[PDB]
Structure 1
Amino acid sequence: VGGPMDASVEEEGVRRALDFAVGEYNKASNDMYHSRALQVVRARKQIDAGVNYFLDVELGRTTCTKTQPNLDNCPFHDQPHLKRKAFCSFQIYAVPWQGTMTLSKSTCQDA
């Protein structure tokens, strides 16, 4: 009911996946020795569609603290050394059946 279906380690995409993983494990790992798979205890897979949102947005620093109300519409800093406008690029990954979002990518260039 909804979850990942089993797949044979024999399967092409699974070998690719498993090779990739062990690969990253070794690259990241700090061992001078190479590790490799003894045995795959379980391999499953899930086709999963989601929407990516790409938003390019200018943010302004408002005059309200995070610990106060109305934040939605309160006014931007006009004092000279207090103001900051940043320009940001956000990538958001949305799985709509699940109602969840993740910030995949985030840069603010700030100016």
Structure 2
Amino acid sequence: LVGGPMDASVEEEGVRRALDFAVGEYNKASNDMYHSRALQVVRARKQIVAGVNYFLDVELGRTTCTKTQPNLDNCPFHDQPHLKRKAFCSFQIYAVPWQGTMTLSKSTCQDA
């Protein structure tokens, strides 16, 4: 899921880590000879953006439809013992709903 900016307690470890890190990046680039530190966090918000990794192990069959034909209404698996083909695969899909997207991060397949 997703969740627009919301106030966070300054005690939250995540905020502590984020603060240090930023005060880190700051001293690393500040035009001063002296190291600076947080005097006061006046405001602290967080937003959680998320994703789902799906791992599906799947068995596939060869159908009758063709990669040419648009009519993918119905495609039985094959009839005759010599046209039927079959593969096993471990797909790994990275989705992130609201962004409306999917990625076949990794696909491993064995034919037999």
TM-score range, shorter chain: 0.5 to 0.7
Cross-structure match for 2:34 = 33
Normalised TM-score (structure 1): 0.53
Note closer, same or farther for the CA distance 1:12–1:27 as it changes in structure 2 (3 Å cut): same
Q: Name the CA shift for 1:69/1:11 in 2 (closer, same or farther; >3 Å).
A: same
Residues 1-111 of structure 1 aligned to structure 2 (within 5 Å): 48-71=49-72, 73-111=74-112
Which is bigger in relative contact order (C-alpha 8 A, separation at least 6)?
2
Offset from partner CA, 1:5-27 (integer Å, 9 cap, x none): 99999999999999999999999
Aligned-residue RMSD, C-alpha:
8.1
CA deviations on 1:2-47 (whole Å, 9 max, x unpaired) are 9999999999999999999999999999999999999999999997
Is the strand fraction higher in 1 or 2? 2
Cα offset, 1:80, TM superposition = 2.9
SS of the aligned residue for 1:3 comes to strand
TM-score normalised by L of structure 2: 0.52
Deviating runs (4+, > 6 A) in structure 1?
Answer: 1-47
Whole-angstrom distance in 2 between the partners of 1:57 and 1:30: 57
- Once the two structures are superposed, residues 34-87 of structure 1 have per-residue CA deviations (whole angstroms, 9 ceiling, x without a partner) of 999999999999975210011111110111111224435311123233221101
Equivalent residue pairs, number: 111
Unaligned runs of 5+ in 2: none
Percent of aligned pairs with the same amino acid: 99
Which runs of 5 or more structure 1 residues have no equivalent in the other structure?
none
Larger radius of gyration: 2
CA contact (8 A) 2:3 2:49 kept: no
